[PDB]
Amino acid sequence: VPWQYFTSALWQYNVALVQMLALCPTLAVTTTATNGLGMGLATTLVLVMTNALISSMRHTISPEVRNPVMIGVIAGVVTLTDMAMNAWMHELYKVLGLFIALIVTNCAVLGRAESFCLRNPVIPSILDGAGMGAGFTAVLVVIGGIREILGSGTLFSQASSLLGSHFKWMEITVIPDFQGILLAILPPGAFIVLGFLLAAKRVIDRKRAERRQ
Amino acid sequence: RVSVVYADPAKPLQLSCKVEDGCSVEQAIQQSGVLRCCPDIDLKKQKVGVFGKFVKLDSPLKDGDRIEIYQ
Amino acid sequence: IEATLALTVMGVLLGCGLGLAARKFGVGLAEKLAAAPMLARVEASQCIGCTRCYRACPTDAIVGASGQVHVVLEDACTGCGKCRDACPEDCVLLIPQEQTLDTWRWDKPAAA
Amino acid sequence: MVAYQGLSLGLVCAVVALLLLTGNIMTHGTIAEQQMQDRLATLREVLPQSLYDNNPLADSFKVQDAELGEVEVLPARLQGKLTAVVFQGRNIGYGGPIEQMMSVDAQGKILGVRVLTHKETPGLADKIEASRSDWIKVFDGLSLENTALDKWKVKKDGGQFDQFAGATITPRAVVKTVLQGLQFQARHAEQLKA
Amino acid sequence: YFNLSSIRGGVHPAAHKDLSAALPIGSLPLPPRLYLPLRQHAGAEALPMVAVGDKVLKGQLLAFPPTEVSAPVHAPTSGRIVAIGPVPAPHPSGLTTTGIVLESDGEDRWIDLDVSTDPFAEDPLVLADRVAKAGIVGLGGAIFPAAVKLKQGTRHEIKTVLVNGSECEPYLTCDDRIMRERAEAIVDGARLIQHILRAYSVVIAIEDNKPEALAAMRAAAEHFGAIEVMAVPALYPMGSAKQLIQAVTGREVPAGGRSTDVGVLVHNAGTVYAIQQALRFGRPLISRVVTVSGACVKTPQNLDVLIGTPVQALIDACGGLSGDPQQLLLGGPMMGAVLPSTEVPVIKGATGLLALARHELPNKDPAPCIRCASCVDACPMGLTPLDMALYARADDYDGASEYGLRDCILCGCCSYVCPSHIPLVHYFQYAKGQQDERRSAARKSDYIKRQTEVRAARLAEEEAAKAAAKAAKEAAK
Amino acid sequence: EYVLFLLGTVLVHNVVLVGFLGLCPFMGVSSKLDPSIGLAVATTLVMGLGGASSWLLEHYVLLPLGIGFIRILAYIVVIAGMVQLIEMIIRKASPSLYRSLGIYLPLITTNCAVLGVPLLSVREGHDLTMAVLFGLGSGLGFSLIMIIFAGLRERLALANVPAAFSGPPIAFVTAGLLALAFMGFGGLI
Amino acid sequence: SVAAGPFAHDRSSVNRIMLDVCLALTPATLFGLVMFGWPAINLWLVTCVSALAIEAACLRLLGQPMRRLLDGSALLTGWLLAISLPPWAPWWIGVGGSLFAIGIGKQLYGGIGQNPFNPAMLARVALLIAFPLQMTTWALPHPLFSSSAPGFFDSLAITFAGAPSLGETSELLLLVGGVWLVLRRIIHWEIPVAILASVFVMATLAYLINPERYAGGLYQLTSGGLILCAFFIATDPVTSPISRVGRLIFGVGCGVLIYVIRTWGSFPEAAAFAVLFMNALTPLIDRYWRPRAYGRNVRGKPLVA
C-alpha cells in the first residue's frame, strides 16, 4: 500500500528524532510554537514539491553530476517559496529570517531527495515527503510548546499576526501570572529539551516493545 | 634436530632433541633420554616407526623426523 | 537577457571540469565510511588399528599406525571432525576441553 | 559523455534562471509598496498629519557629520518653513545594535521617540516598545535648553530618566542616542533647525 | 652509586616486622609425607625419572629438566615413592597438578654428593652447569632458573652484581634472619657469582629498617675489598629489580629489556646462599627459610622448611592457630595468594605463611572513581592506573595496553592508596589473563597451520614421487 | 585589527553554539576524534575557498549585471562545483591524501554553514580579504568546537551514563552545557 | 570466587575527603552567616537540604545504593553553591540551583565520578542567565544581633514569600582553609598557584602599561571570589587534569580567562565561566599530556642505553 510510507514517515523514521537531520532549524527557530508550525509547513511544502519534481525527472539525471543538479532544482524552488513569503506572509518572513531561505541545505531534504526519490515513482515520493514533513512539523510543534511554556507560560501566541486571524482559536494561556524561565528561550534551552525528548522517545520505545512482548 | 614421541595412552610423551647428521634410531634414542624417564621401554620388542612407517634400528634419518615408539 | 550567458558558462565549465577530471578515476551512509573448543578421544579397546584416522587428518594430531597399537591424539586437534566418519567402529569420541590449572584465569569483578 | 554531463547542468541552471525573472516582474512592485507603507506607518507613529503639509518621503536630505556619518533626515514643511525633522539613530545595546527614530521639531523639542529594531532580553527589556510600556514616551516635552548635559543619563549614572528593573544598559543606549541626535540637530542649524 | 632514590612513587605500609624477627631460625621435625609438585619454576615442567615403590635418598634427582629453561626437582629426605600423580597446588584456584608423593622413612641419609675442589679456579661455564644441576630457582618470587640467568649474564659485560637483600614486604622477615645468621655464606656466594660473571664489585643492599642485618653484613664483609654494603630507604616497591637498579645505579632498565643491558644482575640473598651451598658443598636446593606470622599464630617465627612440607605441619610447629584465621596467605600481604586449605605443600617460591585475622584486614566497599590522581602519584613505573581500569573494565584490553599495561608489575601500590576502594590490581590481572589467553590461542593456530602445511607438503611429495616411480616401472615392463 | 576580528569569530561569534550552523554533521561525526580532525580541516579549507569564490561571484558577475535574487543558488552551485571537484580529484590523486581529507566528502557540501557564512558576509558588505578571513575564522571556530566536543564524547563513551541516556541524548545535553559555558564570552569583542 | 590482593590499605575514603573540605570551608561560612544575618542562614539551609533530598531522589531513581549519599558529595555542591549565591535571595533560587546541579549537572551523567562539568558552577551560571534580576541584586551586610538587621520572622518574610574591614576578613579565612587543604595533601598546589600567579602577572603588567585605565585591577585584585575559585572550586578532582603539567595549564588558562572576562567582558562573575571552559578543555589536556613511563621516552618508544 502507498499509505504505509506516510505512516512509517512520522515515528519509525523521523528527521530530527531517528536520522538526526535538520537540527539547525530544529534548535534555531523553536522559541514559539507558531514559529515551529510555520517553518514545518514551509518545509513540508518544499519537500513535497521538490520530491515530485525529482521523481518526475528521475530518469534524466547523470550519475556523477548528481549533486549540483538536484541542489539547483531545490534552490530556485525554495527561492520561489521565499518570493511567496516576502509578498504575502511577510510577518512570518521576518520571524524565521535566514532559515526560511536556508532550506536548500536542510539535510533531511537532500537526504530524502537522494536516497528515496531517485528510484521510486511520483506518488510514493510525494507521500513520503508529506509524511516526513508532518513528522518534522510535529517535532517542531512539541519542542516549541515545551520551550515557550517554560519561558513565557503561554501556549500558541500571536497566531493572528503570524498565521492569520482565523487561527485565533489556537491561543490558550497556561500558568497565568508567570514571568518565565529565560534560559529555555535561549540557545542552551534547546539542546537540553531535544536530549530529553530523545531519551523520552527511547523510553517509550522500550515500554512499547515490552508491552508487545 | 628431530622429535621423539612415546605413544602411551596413559601419558603421551613428546620431546625435541638435536642429532648429528647421519644418525640412526639407536643413537638418537640413547642421546634423547627417553629410556631414563620410562624404564619400561624395550628397544627390541616394542615397535619403532617414523611418521607412521615401520623403521629398523640402524636406518639413517634426515632432519625434521619424528621417531615414534609404541606397542 | 544576458544573465543566461553567465549562468550557462558557470554551469558548463563546472560540468566540463567534472567531465575532464573524471578521467582521473546520503549524509548518514558517508559517516559510517568516515567511522566452544573441541578435542577428540580414542579409547583403549574400540580402536583396532585401521589407520584411517591418520589417513584423514590434515592436522598431525593422531600418532601411530598399523594394528592394535592404540593410536592416540595430541593437543593439535581442532574438532574439525575428519576422524569421526573415517573409522568404521566409531571410537572417536569428541569431548570439550576440561578445566585444568594452566587454563585458569581471573574473573571480572561483579559490579560497582 | 562529458559533453552532456555538462550541457545538462547548463540547461538546468538556465531554466532555473528564467523562472526567476517572471516571478520578480509579478512580485517586485507588490514588495516595494508594502515596504514604503511600512515606512509610512512607522512615520505616522511619531508625528501626526497636522504638522506637515508636503510629503515627508519626497525631499529626503543627506547630511554628513563627524560622529554619525551619513543621516537620512526627513523634513516636515508646512508652507516653505521647516517645522520638524525625523531621522534615525544607531546604538549598540546588550544583545546588538538598536535602530530607533526621533522626530524633533524646529525648536529642539522632541515630539516622539520610537524603537524600530533592537536585540535585548525578552521579559526584561521589552519596555522600550510603546505597545507594552509608557517609558519611551518620556521624551515628549524635553529639549536641549530645559535639560543640560547632566540629566541626559539614567538614574544609575546620575540622571533623571528611569531604568528598568534589572538593567541600566538598554536605557543608557536609548538616552545616549537621543542626546546625540539632539546634539546633531544643534550642530547643523538652519537646514535642520531653522 | 650514591643512591639517587627518587623511585617516582612508593608507599609506606606498616612493616609489622618486630613481632617475628626476635627468635632465631627454628627447625622442623620430619613430617610423614611430602608432596612435591613437578613444576616449581618458570618455563617447562620437569619429567619424572623414578617410579612407584623406588627407594630414594636425600638429594636424589627425582625429576630432570626436558629443556634449557627448567630446573630439576630433588628429594628433600630419604624414603619411598608412593605416587607420581595429582597433588594439591599452592594456587588460589585450588586445582591439582602433576607431582610426586614421598613417604619419609625418617632415617634421613644423605646421598654421595659430588663435592667440588677449588671453585675459584674453573671457567664460568662449568660453574654455571654446576648451578644448573642443583635446582637453584631464584628464591625471590619470580622463580626463574638461576642457571639461565647466569648464562645470559656471561654473554654480555657486567659491571656490578647486585644482591637484592632489601626485603620490603610487610610481615616478612626471612631475609633479615638469613642475613643476620648466614652473612659469611652470602658474601662467599656473592664472590662466587663475581667470579662467574667477570665484573667489578658486588653492591649488597639492605633496607634501613634492618640495622642488625646491616651490622652483620658489614662485620662479615670488611676484609674483601670490592664488596660494598648499601642502605636503601624504607619503601614498599624498593626490593623490585627495576626499582633497586634505578635507586642504586641511577639508570633505568629499558622497556621490554633485561637488566643486563644496564650491565647489572640482580639476585636475592637466599638465592646467593643457595648458589654458595651448591658450588661449595654440592648440596642441591632441598630446603628454604619461610616466615610464619600474623596475629592468628601463637608464636610467629622463621623456620627452615623442607620443600614439599604441608602448610598444616608448619602451622602446628608454630604453636597453633590462636583464634579464627580470616585470611591465610602464602607471601606478603601485597602479593599474597589465598591458600585453599592446609594440605597445600611448600614450593620453592613460597615466601611466607601469614595468617591474618579480622582487625589487620581493611574493610572495603567499592565506590566510583573520583579521579583524585593518587594512583599516578604512587605508581613506581609512572603509569596512569585509572585509565587502565576504565579500559580494562570496558573489555578494551588493546586500549589498556597503550596506557601502560605492558609495563605493569602488579605491585599493588594502586589499591593501597585508593580512597574509593577499587580492586585495581584485580582488573589488571584479569586483563593480562585475557591477553595471555588470546596470545596462546593465536600461537596454537599458527603452529597448527604450520603443521598441516608441512604434513600436506610431505604427503603430496611422497605420493608424487611414488607415482613417478611406479610410472617409470611399468614403462620398462 | 584582523586578530581581534578572528578571535571574535572563533569565540564570541562561534558558528555552532551561538550561530546554530553546521549541527547535523557535527552531531554525527563527533563520536570519534580522528574523523572530527579530518572533517575540521576539510571544512575549514573549503569554507575559506567558498567564501572567496562567493565574494568574487557576487562582486564581479552578480552585482554588475544587477541581478541579486539568484544568489542562494549560484553560490551553492559554485560551491557544489567546487567541492565534488576537489574531492573527486582526490579520489584518484595522491592515494595517501585520501585518508585525511577526501573520505569526508558529501557531509561538508551541504552543512548549512558553507552557505550560511557567505550570506551573512554579504549582509554586512565585507571586502575580499575580510570575507576570506571571516571564512577561515568560522572554519577555525567549527574546528575547535568539534575537537572539544569529540574529546568530551570519547570521554563520555567509557563513563557510566544510564542506558536511557547513553548516546546522542547525552551529546545534546553536553552541547547545551557547552553553549552555556560559551555564553561568558558575550560582549568581549 | 577467589579474593584478589593487595590485603592492605591506608584507611583512606571519599567521605573523609569531602568532610575535610567542608571542615576547611566552615571558618569562612560561619563569618559569612554571622555578618549577613538570618536570610543567609535560611538560604544556606534550604540549598543544602534541597541538594541532599534531590540527591536521594536521583539515587532512588537510578537504582544506585543509598550509601552513595553518605560520602558528602552533594552536601559539598550545595555548600559551595549556597556560599556563591547572593545572600538575601529567595528560596526558589536556591532550590532551582540545587535542582540544576544535582540532577542535570551530576546525576544525569551517571553520578559521582562521571560528570564532565563542575556542578555548582553550572548551577550558578544557569541561575545568573535564567534569573538576571534576582541574581544581581546584592544585599548589604547586616550583622547578627546588631539592632539594625531584621529579626527572625521578618527574615522569614524576606527569604520565603516576597516581602521587600569586612571583605578582607572573609578572604583570609578562605586562604587559611585552602592552605590547610594543601598541607593535608587533599588538593594540589599547582592550580591555585598558577591561577593567582597568572592573574597577578597580567594585572600588574596591565597596570604598568595603562596607569589611568587599568589601575583599578591591582587594589581590588581578589574581587569576584578569586581566592574561593582558586582554592575550593577549580581544584575539583573529577573535572581537572591528573598530571602536573596539565594542572599547570589548567591553572594558567583559568587565570587568563578570569582576568579577560572580568576586565574586558560583560560579566564581573568571571570565575564560573572560566572554570566551565576549562572543564570543557580538560579531556584534551588529559589525553595529550600523559606522564612519562619507566624505561621509555616522552614519545613512548623504549629507551636506548
Ligand SMILES: CCCCCCCCCCCCCCCCCCCC(=O)O[C@H](COC(=O)CCCCCCCCCCCCCC)COP(=O)(O)OCCN
Ligand atoms: C517550573 C518547573 C521547572 C522544571 C524545569 C526545571 C529545569 C530543568 C530541570 C530538569 C531536572 C531533571 C532531574 C532528573 C534528571 C534525570 C535524573 C536521572 C533519571 C534517570 O536517568 O532515569 C532513567 C531515565 O528515565 C526515563 O527512562 C524516562 C525519561 C523521560 C524524559 C521525559 C522528558 C520529557 C520532556 C521534558 C522537557 C523538560 C525537561 C528539560 C528542560 C531511567 O533509568 P534506567 O532505565 O537506567 O534504570 C531503571 C532501573 N534500573
Ligand SMILES: CCCCCCCCCCCCCCCCCCCC(=O)O[C@H](COC(=O)CCCCCCCCCCCCCC)COP(=O)(O)OCCN
Ligand atoms: C593582593 C595584593 C597584595 C599581594 C601581592 C601578591 C599577590 C599574590 C602572589 C601569589 C604568588 C603565587 C606563587 C608564589 C610562589 C609559590 C608558593 C607556594 C610554594 C609551594 O609549592 O608550596 C606548596 C604549599 O604552599 C601552599 O600551600 C601555597 C598555596 C598558594 C598560596 C598563595 C599565597 C602565599 C601565602 C601562603 C600562606 C597564607 C597565610 C595567610 C595568613 C607545596 O607544599 P606541600 O607541603 O603541599 O608540598 C608537598 C608536595 N610534595
Ligand SMILES: CCCCCCCCCCCCO[C@@H]1O[C@H](CO)[C@@H](O[C@H]2O[C@H](CO)[C@@H](O)[C@H](O)[C@H]2O)[C@H](O)[C@H]1O
Ligand atoms: C580565549 C581568550 C580570549 C582572549 C580574548 C582577547 C580579546 C579580548 C580583549 C580585547 C577586548 C576588546 O574589546 C573591547 O572591550 C569592550 C568591553 O568593554 C568591547 O565591548 C563593548 O563594546 C561593544 C560595541 O560597542 C559591545 O559589545 C558593548 O557595548 C561593550 O561590551 C569592545 O568591543 C572593545 O572595545
Ligand SMILES: CCCCCCCCCCCCO[C@@H]1O[C@H](CO)[C@@H](O[C@H]2O[C@H](CO)[C@@H](O)[C@H](O)[C@H]2O)[C@H](O)[C@H]1O
Ligand atoms: C549566603 C551565605 C553565605 C554568604 C557569605 C559567603 C561567604 C564566602 C564568600 C565567598 C565569596 C563571595 O563573593 C564575594 O562576596 C562579596 C561580599 O558580598 C561580594 O561583594 C558584593 O557585595 C558587596 C557589598 O554590597 C559589594 O562590594 C558589591 O555589591 C559586590 O561586590 C563580591 O562579589 C565577592 O568578593
Ligand SMILES: CCCCCCCCCCCCO[C@@H]1O[C@H](CO)[C@@H](O[C@H]2O[C@H](CO)[C@@H](O)[C@H](O)[C@H]2O)[C@H](O)[C@H]1O
Ligand atoms: C521545619 C519547618 C519547615 C521549615 C521549612 C519551611 C519553611 C516555611 C516558611 C513558611 C513561611 C511563611 O511566610 C512567613 O510566615 C511567617 C510565620 O511562619 C509569618 O510571620 C508572621 O507570623 C508569625 C507567627 O506565625 C509572627 O510571629 C510574625 O510576627 C508574623 O510576621 C511571615 O509574615 C510570613 O512571611
Ligand SMILES: CCCCCCCCCCCCO[C@@H]1O[C@H](CO)[C@@H](O[C@H]2O[C@H](CO)[C@@H](O)[C@H](O)[C@H]2O)[C@H](O)[C@H]1O
Ligand atoms: C526543600 C525546601 C523547600 C522550602 C520551601 C519553602 C516554601 C515556602 C514558600 C511557600 C509558598 C508561599 O507561601 C506563603 O503563601 C501565603 C499565601 O499563599 C503567603 O503568606 C501568608 O500566609 C502565611 C501562612 O502560610 C502567613 O504566615 C503569612 O503571614 C501570610 O503572608 C505568602 O505568599 C507565603 O508565605
Ligand SMILES: CCCCCCCCCCCCO[C@@H]1O[C@H](CO)[C@@H](O[C@H]2O[C@H](CO)[C@@H](O)[C@H](O)[C@H]2O)[C@H](O)[C@H]1O
Ligand atoms: C535555572 C534553571 C533551573 C530552573 C529550575 C526551576 C527554578 C525554580 C522555579 C522558578 C520559578 C519561576 O517563578 C518565579 O516565581 C516567583 C514567585 O515568587 C516570582 O516572584 C514574584 O512574586 C514575588 C512575591 O509575590 C514578588 O515579590 C516578586 O517581585 C515577583 O518576581 C518570580 O518572578 C518568578 O521568576
Ligand SMILES: CCCCCCCCCCCCO[C@@H]1O[C@H](CO)[C@@H](O[C@H]2O[C@H](CO)[C@@H](O)[C@H](O)[C@H]2O)[C@H](O)[C@H]1O
Ligand atoms: C600573557 C602576557 C600578558 C598579556 C596580558 C594582556 C595585557 C593587556 C594587553 C595590553 C592592553 C593595554 O591596552 C592598551 O592601552 C594603551 C595604553 O597605552 C592604549 O593606548 C592608547 O593610549 C596611549 C597613551 O596612553 C597612546 O599612546 C596610544 O596611541 C593609544 O592607543 C591602547 O589603545 C590599548 O590597546
Ligand SMILES: CCCCCCCCCCCCO[C@@H]1O[C@H](CO)[C@@H](O[C@H]2O[C@H](CO)[C@@H](O)[C@H](O)[C@H]2O)[C@H](O)[C@H]1O
Ligand atoms: C592573553 C589575553 C590577551 C588579552 C587581550 C590583549 C589584547 C587587548 C587589546 C585591547 C585593549 C583594550 O583597548 C581598549 O581599551 C579601552 C580603554 O582605553 C577600553 O574601553 C572601551 O570601553 C567601552 C565599553 O565599555 C567601549 O565602548 C569603548 O570603545 C572604549 O572606551 C576597551 O577595552 C578597548 O576598546
Ligand SMILES: Cc1cc2nc3c(=O)[nH]c(=O)nc-3n(C[C@H](O)[C@H](O)[C@H](O)COP(=O)(O)O)c2cc1C
Ligand atoms: C612487585 C615486586 C615485588 C618484589 N618484591 C621483592 C621482595 O620483597 N624481595 C626480593 O628479594 N625481591 C623482590 N622483587 C624482585 C624479584 O622478586 C627478584 O628478586 C628478581 O627479579 C630476581 O631475583 P632471583 O633471581 O633471586 O629471583 C620484587 C619484584 C617485584 C616486581
Ligand SMILES: Cc1cc2nc3c(=O)[nH]c(=O)nc-3n(C[C@H](O)[C@H](O)[C@H](O)CO)c2cc1C
Ligand atoms: C577539593 C574538592 C573540590 C570540590 N569542588 C567542587 C565544586 O567546586 N563544585 C561541586 O559541585 N563539587 C565540588 N566537589 C565535589 C565533587 O568534586 C563533585 O561531587 C564532583 O562533581 C563529583 O561529580 C569538590 C570536591 C573536592 C574534594
Ligand code: SF4
Ligand atoms: S581410524 Fe578410527 S578405528 Fe581406525 S585406528 Fe584410527 S581411531 Fe582407531
Ligand code: SF4
Ligand atoms: S577432529 Fe580433526 S584435528 Fe581433531 S583429531 Fe580429529 S581429524 Fe585431527
Ligand code: SF4
Ligand atoms: S600495579 Fe602496575 S600500574 Fe599499579 S602501581 Fe604497580 S606498576 Fe603501577
Ligand code: SF4
Ligand atoms: S586512586 Fe581510585 S579514585 Fe583516585 S584516581 Fe585512582 S582509581 Fe580514581
Ligand code: FES
Ligand atoms: S547542518 Fe543544518 S540541517 Fe544539517
